[PDB]
Structures are given as structure tokens and as C-alpha cells.
């Protein structure tokens, strides 16, 4: 009550919670990128110079 509003007690705890979620989301995004079909070029029909149809 000296230098802080009343809502800060809730915000501070919520901020710590939000921080943990953001950290977990960061690792998640990292792993999804290194296993995606764009990074590994999976299910991507690479265009050939002569357009050969198997």
C-alpha cells in the first residue's frame, strides 16, 4: 500500500504463472519447428525440371 496498487498482489502471482507458460510455450515452438514438414521438407512435392510423372 506504500508504492503499489491493490491489484498488484494478483498481478504478480499471475505474472509468475504467465512467465512459466511462456517458457513452456518457447520450448514447444522450438521442438515443433525442428520436426515440422516444412523444415524436413516432408509431403512437399518438389518441382522437377522436366515434370516427370511416376
Amino acid at each position: 500500500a506504500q508504492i503499489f496498487p491493490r491489484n498488484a498482489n494478483l498481478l504478480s502471482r499471475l505474472s509468475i504463472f504467465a512467465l512459466v507458460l511462456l517458457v513452456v510455450e518457447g520450448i514447444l515452438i522450438l521442438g515443433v519447428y525442428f520436426r515440422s514438414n516444412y523444415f524436413r521438407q516432408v509431403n512437399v512435392a518438389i518441382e522437377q525440371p522436366v515434370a516427370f510423372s511416376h
Binding site: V24, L28, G31, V32, R35
Partner: peptide, 27 residues
Amino acid sequence: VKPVFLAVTLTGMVAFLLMVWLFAFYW
């Protein structure tokens, strides 16, 4: 108090399912 303990619990298992999916049955 007891409500937020349940909230931080559901948050944890949510993350685990999420993470386990990515590093196991994802490919």
C-alpha cells in the same frame, strides 16, 4: 486458494500432454 492449486495442477498436466505429444507421438 484451493481453486488456484487446482488451476496450477490442470496447467501442469495440460503442458505434459502437450510436450509428450511433441516428443513422442508426433514425428
